[PDB]
């Protein structure tokens, strides 16, 4: 996970949770309206009952758009007045009900009249574990924030069931990998370093290619599982991370989006907000991504 690594590396010590498809779907909107270099840089990111996603594109009513851009976006387009602030409330309310109240509010600042376009993505997930953890076994255990810093966490336990699992030996660290299934066709794969402090070097090699190799090697084995019950919400500005990743002709002035608008527009911000709740009964998650395109008058 390209983007995950960047964000993780730049927030050492911090919990991190992101939804790659949500980010990828906004970048794709931007792609649809970009030309040249900007388009080339972005192309590298153009890509059930448990997972739902939706994209909305809001355009400034006084702007004139390119039909191609609009053709590529489909019935996800809508014209609005960014001037009126009820506009921000209508957008948030929409992201809010689609994410079952988990992402609210996505937009924190009254948008600028300098704004031309908002491409928003929202995704929602909720599913019960194929096999629930029994609350009876949930109890407080020390969690190692660092080798000698212990903090109390509510730990869930499931004894003597079997799960797909693999002991992985790698030049960058050894770890255990397990798959916890959800009712339906999704699962949660967890990567646990053998070294109390070895996550970073493994994190640094978390690649789509590597990740699949590890999954491919898993076999059913009996193993007892203890994992924290947890809730986390994150808010990330993705620009820096994305620039560091090679999207240098995408944000600000140098952004070329003449395949979107007539005027000269620029993308001056890109936020990602997320939420996840892991409990003994189910896992619930949501995320929303927004890129704000401005510069037109």
């Amino acid at each position: 996970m390209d983007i995950f690594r960047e964000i993780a590396s730049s927030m050492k010590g911090e919990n991190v949770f992101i939804s790659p498809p949500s980010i990828s779907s906004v970048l794709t909107i931007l792609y649809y309206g970009a030309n040249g270099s900007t388009a080339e840089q972005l192309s590298k990111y153009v890509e059930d009952i448990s997972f739902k996603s939706m994209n909305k594109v809001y355009g400034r009513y006084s702007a004139v758009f390119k039909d191609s851009f609009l053709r590529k976006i489909g019935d996800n387009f809508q014209t609005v007045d960014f001037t009126d602030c009820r506009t921000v409330d209508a957008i948030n309310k929409c992201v809010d009900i689609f994410t079952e109240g988990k992402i609210n509010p996505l937009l924190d600042e009254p948008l600028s009249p300098d704004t031309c376009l908002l491409a928003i993505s929202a995704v929602y997930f909720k599913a019960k574990w194929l096999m629930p953890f029994e609350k009876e076994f949930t109890s407080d255990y020390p969690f190692y924030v660092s080798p000698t810093e212990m903090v109390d966490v509510s730990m869930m336990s499931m004894y003597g069931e079997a799960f797909n699992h693999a002991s992985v030996k790698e030049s960058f660290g050894n770890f255990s990998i397990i798959e916890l299934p959800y009712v339906g066709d999704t699962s949660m794969v967890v990567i646990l370093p053998d070294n109390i402090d070895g996550l970073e070097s493994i994190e640094q090699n978390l690649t789509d290619t590597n990740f699949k190799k590890w999954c491919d090697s898993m076999d059913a084995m009996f193993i007892d599982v203890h994992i924290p019950k947890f809730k986390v919400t994150g808010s990330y500005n993705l620009v820096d991370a994305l620039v560091k990743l090679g999207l240098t002709e995408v944000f600000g002035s140098t952004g070329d989006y003449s395949n979107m608008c007539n005027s000269d527009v620029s993308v001056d911000a890109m936020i990602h907000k997320t939420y996840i709740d892991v409990n003994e009964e189910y896992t619930e998650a949501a995320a929303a991504t927004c890129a704000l395109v401005a510069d037109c008058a």
Binding site: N15, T186, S187, D194, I276
Partner: protein
Amino acid sequence: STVTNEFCADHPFIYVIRHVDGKILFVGRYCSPTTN
């Protein structure tokens, strides 16, 4: 070596929510608990 009888996540770990085929829906890192 690595464990294979017990999966004790009492230290930082990575978790990935994915579709069985293979599409990754969410990726996170658990460094420490939050609030209480």
